[PDB]
Design a protein around this ligand. Sequence first.
Ligand code: ZN
Length: 195
Amino acid sequence: SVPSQKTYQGSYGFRLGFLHSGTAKSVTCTYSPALNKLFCQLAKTCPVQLWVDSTPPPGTRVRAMAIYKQSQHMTEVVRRCPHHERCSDSDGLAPPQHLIRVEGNLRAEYLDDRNTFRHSVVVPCEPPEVGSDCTTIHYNYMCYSSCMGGMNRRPILTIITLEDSSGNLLGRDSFEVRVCACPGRDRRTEEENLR
Ligand SMILES: [Zn+2]
């Protein structure tokens, strides 16, 4: 009924990494370590790094799924709102109902779970380019946290799972996400509230 969100590095020492983009009002995507929360604009590139201590087997994949953060909403499938699922902004691969898309990866697969009805996007786990120490996936969130009839101001978490070729768990990490008009200002505000 509810996907696990327990951090698990697993045998390969799997964990996420985020850039340090700052909080200028112009920033389009910014991550707060103190809040473990990514703030981003609608449909803008969200670079998420994948780090491992050892190389996982050929066929390993990386899946992203969103769930509501509040327990009383956790059984509800996170999906795009009645407006955005109908705006015909398809990239040719992602179903119009899916909140999370992967940018620039023709091998991305989108799943509508036949039992839970939850949405997810999965890609092959690739090694870093020569000269790099990690691999980066570029995600896009396709609705604002405030969209009526959809997330409707409810906070969500994105769960990233490292899986084997059968879909079995190898590792897991997660972070809260707020899709908003001014990520820099909102990150500053929430960090101040926390302080
Ligand atoms: Zn929307």
